[PDB]
Amino acid sequence: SLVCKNALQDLSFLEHLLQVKYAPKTWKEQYLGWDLVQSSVSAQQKLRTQENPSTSFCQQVLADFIGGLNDFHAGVTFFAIESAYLPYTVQKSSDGRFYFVDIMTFSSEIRVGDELLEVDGAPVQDVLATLYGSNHKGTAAEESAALRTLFSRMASLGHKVPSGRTTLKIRRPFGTTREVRVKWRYVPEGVGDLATIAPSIRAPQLQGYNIGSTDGFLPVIGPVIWESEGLFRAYISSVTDGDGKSHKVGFLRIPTYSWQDMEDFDPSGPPPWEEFAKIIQVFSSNTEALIIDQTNNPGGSVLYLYALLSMLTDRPLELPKHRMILTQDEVVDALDWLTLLENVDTNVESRLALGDNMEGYTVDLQVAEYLKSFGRQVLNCWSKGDIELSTPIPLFGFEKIHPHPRVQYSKPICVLINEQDFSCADFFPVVLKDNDRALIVGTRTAGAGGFVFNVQFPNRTGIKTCSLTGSLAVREHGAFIENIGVEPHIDLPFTANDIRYKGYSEYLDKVKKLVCQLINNDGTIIL
Amino acid sequence: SLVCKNALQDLSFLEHLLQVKYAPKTWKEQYLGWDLVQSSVSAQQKLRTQENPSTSFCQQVLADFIGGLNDFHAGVTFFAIESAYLPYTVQKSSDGRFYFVDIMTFSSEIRVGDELLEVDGAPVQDVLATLYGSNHKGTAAEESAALRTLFSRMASLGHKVPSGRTTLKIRRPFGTTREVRVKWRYVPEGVGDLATIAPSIRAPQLQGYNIGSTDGFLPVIGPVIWESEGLFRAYISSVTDGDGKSHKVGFLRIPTYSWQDMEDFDPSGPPPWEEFAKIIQVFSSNTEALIIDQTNNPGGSVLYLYALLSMLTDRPLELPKHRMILTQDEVVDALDWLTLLENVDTNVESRLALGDNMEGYTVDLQVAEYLKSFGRQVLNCWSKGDIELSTPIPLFGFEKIHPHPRVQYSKPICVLINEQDFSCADFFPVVLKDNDRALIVGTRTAGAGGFVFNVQFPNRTGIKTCSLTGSLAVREHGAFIENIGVEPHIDLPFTANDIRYKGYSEYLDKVKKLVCQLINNDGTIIL
């Protein structure tokens, strides 16, 4: 079969990337009991056994192949526009119930606050269990990843697109239930299945709760006495400990670390780190403690992440390192760094070579050194044959983050974290936590622990991009971030009261009571 | 063997690409009697048969594997720095002899105009003959390509990097013989050969004459009266005929069509096509004709190419179509064009969706219409299965070049062309030739008839990029451009005397005899 042959070929290539570029392979083998061979063999058999397999069927197989790695950074996307969609956003409450937190339609049979009980007659958890990956381990992160999928099916992601009408069973706020008949918003496939055309191909012949939300989903913490509304959501409000004293608390939400992707971002105006700077300065002299909302963050540029950190501390902070998978590629990069920084001795020379600013991070002489060290260390590992999963080397060689020369918030910080915090959104609280800089509150992060790289290549299976992790981050005391993520100081999940009536008062109250303590006791959260 | 295994994997990948995304395949088979299945097996063997193959040895096999397509667009590069230079530059005058034309060192024996008889006891020819390709067919184009590397060997391009001193047997311009012993400038590899590291690798344990030159090489045609000071070498000059009669001819050289790679291009000021405008408006009002230097051009951006052509005419110019190979990626491109121009019914709407211009080409409703057509066409070949070597389709749907609405040189034009003109530098003269807009002189063009795409993918073999051709251009009369190239109106090669002392007077004279003949006639008698 034409589609079958291409799929196997395309599958063999994916298999080969895993052996030369997927770093956490050893980690996935142990922590998950994952097995490349098992995976390969199984996938090939699925492919060969099919009676006249369709293009999508194969994509679904490759999709499941990489899906088995249980890696939020490891996936495959396709050249397919076929999709199914229901305009409902649901959020799982601590006790296990599923409430509708947003309805993007004028239909009125379901309201914000109704509880989802069944889908097509099957209990939510059941439907969800058919959306999990091959090596599911029931973590909240996986659960939520699956939840995003409940009402959004895309062939571009390897999903099997449903269609037609379906029955959701809800529980209205006052106890009664209803069964609602709904129809999937369906977009038919616009890219012809190859299997359908194969036979006619003759031989050639000449002649929001949305991840990344700028505003996030938390309501103000109290009476606003300042707010920027420019590019980031940032404001200053009050609070009042039980003693009757009032404090000025700041609130800032970092939506992503992929700045070129922030809503309303003009690439002709000043970059977002310069605005971040204005916010922090306002905070420095107008606030007594800072609350950073970082939930539902997709991650992004490490250099950008570093910049934001450099402005949130007056002292240097230790950064975790990465065990990298190597190829001559990274070698030349190493060479290139050395040849570019050969003759650099002063801060000034650093700047004329690096740009004096690396996506917000200040180009210093030490940066030139750090960079120089990295690359040396890389070349070393290469000659010592340590290219399978090198000893830990910090990204860019930055052994640590050095406070920003001009702006630096030095007061107590409080970071809110989610089960939907990936990569840089993992690292941010990691760095603030290991150096004891901020109080992390909320829930264990997802655990995408290692940088991503994407791969493209022509093929007839419709593969667009295959993303893979190229390193394994190692925290200071030796823990890997991959899969495990970061645990916050205070475990504070959202309750059904927080969620049901989009107030989150129970949550916010605890955060306020918590931050008041940092203001009084000086950090040091006792009770 | 490790290096052997990776090499065979990556070879199997390049081979697969050739069957899915190499449009010229069917052509190279009939024209070069080439065979994939055969070419691949040969390299497979060249790899197995080798004892302890080096990363280098392998790169060379792949370099040669592709090199056997005799396509100036199909090539491979690597993350290797080992190079061997030599500040010298040859050129091969028409008589079939090789002469020197440049020295980039410190005063040394070898003189301008000195012939080249041998290298270390071998007659130049045979030397170059070792630099030809698996299917070299002896044409100025190929030969010139070889010559380029004769004094520049690079591992990154897949060359065996020689070293140490050597002897060039030169012949003084008057009859006497010499032999100057020289030592290549060497660059030792910085990327450790994988074969040397293999053993120690333990499993991962957890826990000028420059193709593209601005000025180019030709000397001013005569007494300069005006000259532009921008990016392009443009000036005006008197010219008398064989009757004492004087005319003001114009001169403009298009170095490359990849506008962003122009010597001194300032990415913040105006784009090169705007300077082109100014230069022409001037020419339009101070010239009786126009000479265009288009020799030594690596092609560039197809749209920019159109933009220049659109300012060099007062009537639409018929564009040659491309036979393409399709994958779902192209299909989606088609879909995306259609959803983007869905409701564009005016010029304002067009300009809004596509911008006032696309790399210089003026955006019209006509343009939006072209693009919409392009999409329907690609989609139609897909559904019909015409995906191996599509029915001819114009790039972007542009069936013809429409004159710029504001600048249009309409007076006779002369274009100079040689064997170092590729992709777009193939189209320029052919479009102007097939439409009878200009007089075309020089020598046949390279023969790179089809657009390019670059494939990158991680590997241990050190492959960096593999470029291939995604189409086969077809001229108005059915002929191709791949290999064949574009024939000039008048065959005006550079003869010994021209090169010998970089005077090219002999050549530049027959040019003006021609430019002149052009000023004295309403002539382009289209019949």
From Swiss-Prot, chains A, B:
Q: Which family does it belong to?
A: Belongs to the chlamydial CPn_1016/CT_858/TC_0248 family.
Cite the SUPFAM superfamilies for this sequence. Answer: ClpP/crotonase
Tell me which SMART domains the record gives. TSPc
Q: Which organism is it from?
A: Chlamydia trachomatis serovar D (strain ATCC VR-885 / DSM 19411 / UW-3/Cx)
What name has this protein been given in UniProt? Protein CT_858
- GO:BP terms for this protein? proteolysis; signal transduction
Q: Which GO terms describe its cellular component?
A: outer membrane-bounded periplasmic space
Query: Listed GO molecular functions?
Result: endopeptidase activity; serine-type peptidase activity
The domain of life is Bacteria
What Pfam families has UniProt attached to this entry?
Answer: PDZ_4, Peptidase_S41
